[PDB]
């Protein structure tokens, strides 16, 4: 009939989109974390009723953003640090009174560019290598090295990633949510909740849990070659510690070139581990291997075992605790098989210092060593299994995007489109 | 009510209609460091995204309307749907999918409509 | 715009219940309403009831309100304006005067004044 077209300016209609995004928050961290606007008081989350959107965790761009944010903040926190470059020198090392720990003396460049010193420092064994037997970094024949800033803290500081003005969030209010697929409640966010960048291995710590039911997720299942993202419902408590009395003994290497270097252990050596319930690690596999069930058999036994090979950091419990970076055997924790139908797990802990970080092959770094007996508590919120192409599940992982996936799936990015043009019985005058 | 910022996405098209000046308030506001870069693109993509539907409101003759009225007669050929079965059926995320190829056209038909109608008034008032 | 199947001829005796499903599909379920309708050999059609999946309400007529149990399930989603939903129908009290043909029938509209009228009917069921 008579039907002309109307303008709206501010409807409820969006698209799926990608933009950049930016930080918010609450010593300066590696994180920037001062640099971010202030986080507001009062967090401003819209339900959306009736409206059931689709989601992708697998395709979520904020994931690839926040993965080379960290990176780029990484290496941001690097630059004004000094160089160990002067430090790849040959080293005389001897055992220290097994065999893990050595004691290295080398010479080194003072103040003044004509004048050395014979200094000693303790190295980790994975650290140097061979040629008093004559050693050498691990680095200096691969990358450069960059000592980090003593004074920036690994420590994870919750991160809120917002959208721009004109855009917006959508969350996932479905408590049983997998991956993918449509969700039915749905809520808008100008940011979201607070992320924390735990840089982790296998297990996935201090990280958000699952209500209801302990979640699986994964892009094809059936796909041996990817990593199953299992989040659990009840956090599992692990505890680790340094015990040794490490000290931190300064080396003037050059103007204002200060390299911290380990002194001596002061009292007895020990062994870096972490503790596990296993009362608790007994019942939370069991919560995973019931839902491993529904995917792939009532009567198939489903069986746990150590990783397969790799490199130190995917092949253990790879993390960091108080500055000093672990590499945790976790053999104890994946030795299991499961049919259709006081307890403590300990894990040998090795510490490295000359550390890689991401895998960058070029940009390696030396923490400096933490004064004190070293010891921190965190749950184990999420795990990293990898099925064998009696189906048996290994622990894994590399890729550090899989960690923020584990945090990003309820989120998306969308842009608002506020332009609406619908026929109406309107029409302007003359 | 209130229902907030897209609070009536899943509503009818009628029902959201009402609730203009709460999706227009937060389209400029919101309900050399990495983050300095990263924030100072996005104050200038959300600057540059509303100037964009201003300019076409502003060549529309709608510049200040929520709803506007215009002269363009609504070609069935976009949608032939009775007025009963979209305001008060319809929600604005499906009416968008359905009018996705037209939009084009219709936006070029509200222009020209006002260069036509201005030049109609500066000859109405030339006299 | 979907198709609102039914269940099967359940031919039973005076005393019993009968329990009638009508699974939809097409449709985002929980949008509409479903009404409940028969057409029995003494009279013409009657209407019964129709019951919201979204607010869970039920508006039945005074003639069936004791006999008729109306629940209704919670829609699957499938896309984002399409979802699978059921929705159920007993009556109490049988006899053979309630011998006919039952339908269920989507809602007509999402609001106005024609919100809950029968508008997209099933295929019906056979009773005693």
């Known amino acids: 009939e008579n039907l002309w077209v109307t303008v709206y300016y501010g409807v409820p209609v969006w698209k799926d989109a990608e933009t950049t995004l930016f930080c918010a928050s609450d010593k300066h961290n590696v994180w920037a974390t001062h640099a971010c606007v202030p986080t507001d008081p009062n967090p401003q989350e819209i339900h959306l009723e009736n409206v059931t959107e689709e989601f992708n965790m697998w395709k979520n761009n904020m994931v690839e953003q926040m993965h080379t944010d960290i990176i780029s903040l990484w290496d941001q926190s690097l630059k004004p640090c000094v160089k160990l470059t002067p430090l790849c020198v040959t080293l005389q090392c001897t055992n220290v009174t097994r065999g893990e720990l050595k004691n290295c003396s080398f010479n080194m460049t003072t103040e003044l560019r004509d004048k050395k010193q014979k200094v000693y420092s303790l190295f980790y064994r994975l650290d140097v290598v061979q040629i008093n037997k004559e050693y050498r970094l691990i680095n200096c024949n691969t990358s450069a090295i960059t000592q980090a800033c003593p004074k920036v803290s690994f420590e994870p500081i919750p991160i809120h990633y917002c959208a721009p003005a004109g855009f917006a969030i959508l969350k996932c209010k479905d408590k049983k949510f997998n991956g993918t697929g449509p969700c039915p409640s749905v809520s808008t966010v100008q940011c979201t909740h607070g992320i924390k960048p735990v840089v982790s291995t296998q297990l996935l710590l201090n990280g958000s849990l699952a209500e209801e039911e302990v979640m699986i997720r994964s892009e094809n299942i059936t796909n041996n070659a990817k990593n199953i993202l299992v989040q659990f419902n009840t956090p599992v408590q692990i505890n680790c510690t340094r015990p040794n009395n490490n000290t931190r003994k300064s080396i003037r290497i050059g103007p204002g070139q200060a390299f911290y270097a380990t002194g001596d252990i002061i009292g007895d050596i020990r062994q870096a581990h972490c503790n596990v319930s296993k009362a608790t690690w007994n019942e939370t596999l069991g919560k995973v291997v019931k839902q491993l069930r529904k995917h792939f058999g009532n009567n198939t036994i489903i069986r746990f075992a150590n990783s397969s090979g790799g490199d130190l950091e995917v092949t253990t419990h790879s993390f960091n605790c108080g500055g000093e970076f672990f590499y945790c055997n976790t053999s104890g924790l994946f030795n299991s098989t499961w049919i259709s139908n006081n307890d403590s797990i300990t894990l040998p802990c090795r510490i490295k210092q000359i550390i890689n970080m991401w895998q960058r092959i070029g940009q390696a770094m030396y923490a400096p060593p933490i004064q004190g007996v070293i010891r921190c508590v965190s749950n184990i919120t999420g795990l990293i299994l990898t099925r064998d192409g009696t189906e048996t599940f290994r622990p894994g992982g590399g890729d550090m995007r899989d960690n923020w996936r584990s945090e990003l799936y309820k989120y998306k990015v969308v842009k608002i489109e506020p332009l609406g043009v619908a026929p109406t019985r309107c029409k302007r005058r003359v | 009510v209130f229902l907030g910022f897209l609070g009536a996405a899943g509503s009818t098209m009628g029902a959201a209609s009402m609730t203009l000046t709460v999706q227009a308030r937060n389209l400029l506001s919101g309900i050399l460091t990495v983050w300095g870069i990263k924030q100072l693109q996005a104050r200038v993509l959300a600057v540059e995204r509303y100037l964009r539907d201003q300019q076409l409101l502003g060549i529309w003759g709608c510049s200040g309307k929520l709803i506007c009225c215009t002269n363009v007669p609504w070609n069935s050929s976009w949608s032939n749907r009775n007025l009963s079965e979209i305001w008060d059926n319809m929600t604005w995320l499906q009416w968008d999918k359905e009018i996705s190829n037209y939009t084009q056209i219709i936006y070029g038909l509200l222009e020209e409509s006002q260069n036509q109608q201005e030049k109609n008034e500066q000859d109405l008032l030339a006299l | 715009q979907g198709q609102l199947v039914q269940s099967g001829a359940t031919t039973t005796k005076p005393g019993s219940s009968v329990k009638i499903s009508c699974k939809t599909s097409?449709?985002?379920?929980?949008?509409?309403?479903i009404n409940w309708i028969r057409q029995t050999a003494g009279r013409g059609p009657e209407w019964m009831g129709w019951?919201?999946?979204?607010?869970?309400?039920?508006?039945?007529?005074?003639?069936?309100?004791?006999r008729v149990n109306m629940t209704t399930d919670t829609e699957v989603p499938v896309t984002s304006f399409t979802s699978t939903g059921a929705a159920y129908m007993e009556i109490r009290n049988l006899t053979s005067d309630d011998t006919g043909t039952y339908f269920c029938?989507?809602?007509?509209?999402?609001?106005?004044?024609?919100?809950?009228?029968?508008?997209?009917w099933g295929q019906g069921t056979l009773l005693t």
């Open positions: 029938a989507k809602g007509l509209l999402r609001d106005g004044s024609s919100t809950w009228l029968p508008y997209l």
């Open positions: 097409g449709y985002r379920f929980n949008f509409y309403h």
């Open positions: 019951i919201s999946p979204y607010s869970g309400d039920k508006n039945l007529a005074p003639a069936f309100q004791d």
